[PDB]
Amino acid sequence: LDTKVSELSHKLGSSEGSNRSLEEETARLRSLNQQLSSSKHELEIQLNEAKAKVLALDEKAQSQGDVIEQQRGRLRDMEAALRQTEQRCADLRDTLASAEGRAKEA
Amino acid sequence: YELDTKVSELSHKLGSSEGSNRSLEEETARLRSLNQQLSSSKHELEIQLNEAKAKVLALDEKAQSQGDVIEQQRGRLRDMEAALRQTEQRCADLRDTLASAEGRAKE
Amino acid sequence: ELDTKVSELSHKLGSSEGSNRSLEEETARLRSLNQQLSSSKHELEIQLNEAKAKVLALDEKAQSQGDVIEQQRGRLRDMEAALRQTEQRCADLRDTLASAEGRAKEA
Amino acid sequence: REVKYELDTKVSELSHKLGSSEGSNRSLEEETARLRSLNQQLSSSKHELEIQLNEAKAKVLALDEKAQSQGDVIEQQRGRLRDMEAALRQTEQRCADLRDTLASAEGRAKE
């Protein structure tokens, strides 16, 4: 019975020593988990803000691109209208000079 | 009898200690697993944030350049509207002089 | 013999008890996690319903705005046309007037 | 055999205490497994709602952004329509004035 008491005390000591270490580790892990869970929540807030800014910038860039192309088209049409109006001027000048020449003959 | 009660007391206390150990080992494994899942979500969100922040800078840069083009086209459009208004006015004056000479030639 | 059975039972009892306290410990944390998850779920449900509602209202507004834009574009082209034609009538009256002025001058 | 009765009672007492403990353990394991299941279901719903919410929130921002840009176009077009109405009103008025001046010149030329 004396040998049994010794064997059990011995097994209990080993088990309890292991237990105190495991209780420390559970406490350590619960703490790290709380910290990671907080960082995760924080990164989610920051990501949502950054993703929001991307969408706003995407819409601005797409709208700006449309404006540029609309203005490009309008500039082309204006260049054409100006070239044609100046050409009508030049033609009127020549027709006037020709009518003056016709009239001179008398 | 007093020695028999000690063995029974130690056996019971050993069983309780072992049961606590079996449980603590399971909980440590449960917590370690959760920790690497949380650690992975954190690392993932960091990658995604860095990419989103990068995309914002690229879009800010593009939006600023596009904004410059828009205003330099607006300025050019204004100058073209002006040139056209003035040229059309010179045309209209030439048309009046030509129409007048046509009328004089007719009579 | 019977004393070894007593030792065997006491050890098994302690282990069973220890396991039981571990489950009591577990149930409690599970009840807590459940309450937290249930609350996040309720919150997300509210937010989703609101966001889905806002999507419908924005889709409706975007579609109506698109109609206006196209109606205005159609009206702009009809006004451009009317202006082009009216200016052409002007130019023709301006030529007729300049012609009459020239005819009067020679007489 | 008086000691055997005292030892026999212990075995009996401990056996019944073990069975009862073993039984309580099976009930507690059912509650842990009932709660673990509900937790998994709730955790899954949460993850699902987060995906859906992120998508819906994204769509809201894109639509808000589009509606603001469309509103700018509408107002730019309204301004341009007003300027065109004015140009047209003025051109038609110049026409009417040229018609009157022409009719006058025709009348003077006749006399």
Short mmCIF file of C-alpha atoms in Angstrom, two decimals, chain A residues 5 12 18 26 37-38 40 54 59 64 74-75 78 84 86-87 93 103 106:
data_model
loop_
_atom_site.label_atom_id
_atom_site.label_comp_id
_atom_site.label_asym_id
_atom_site.label_seq_id
_atom_site.Cartn_x
_atom_site.Cartn_y
_atom_site.Cartn_z
CA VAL A 5 0.65 5.82 -2.26
CA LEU A 12 -0.40 13.35 -9.43
CA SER A 18 1.58 19.76 -16.59
CA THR A 26 -4.77 28.78 -22.33
CA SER A 37 -9.71 39.64 -33.15
CA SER A 38 -9.32 43.43 -32.43
CA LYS A 40 -9.01 42.02 -37.65
CA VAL A 54 -11.45 53.08 -54.87
CA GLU A 59 -16.42 56.54 -61.06
CA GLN A 64 -13.63 62.12 -66.78
CA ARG A 74 -16.36 68.64 -80.24
CA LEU A 75 -12.83 70.04 -80.87
CA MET A 78 -14.92 72.93 -84.44
CA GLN A 84 -14.78 75.51 -93.85
CA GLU A 86 -12.26 80.45 -93.52
CA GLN A 87 -12.52 78.62 -96.93
CA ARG A 93 -12.88 87.33 -101.69
CA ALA A 103 -17.69 95.25 -114.06
CA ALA A 106 -17.22 98.57 -120.21
#
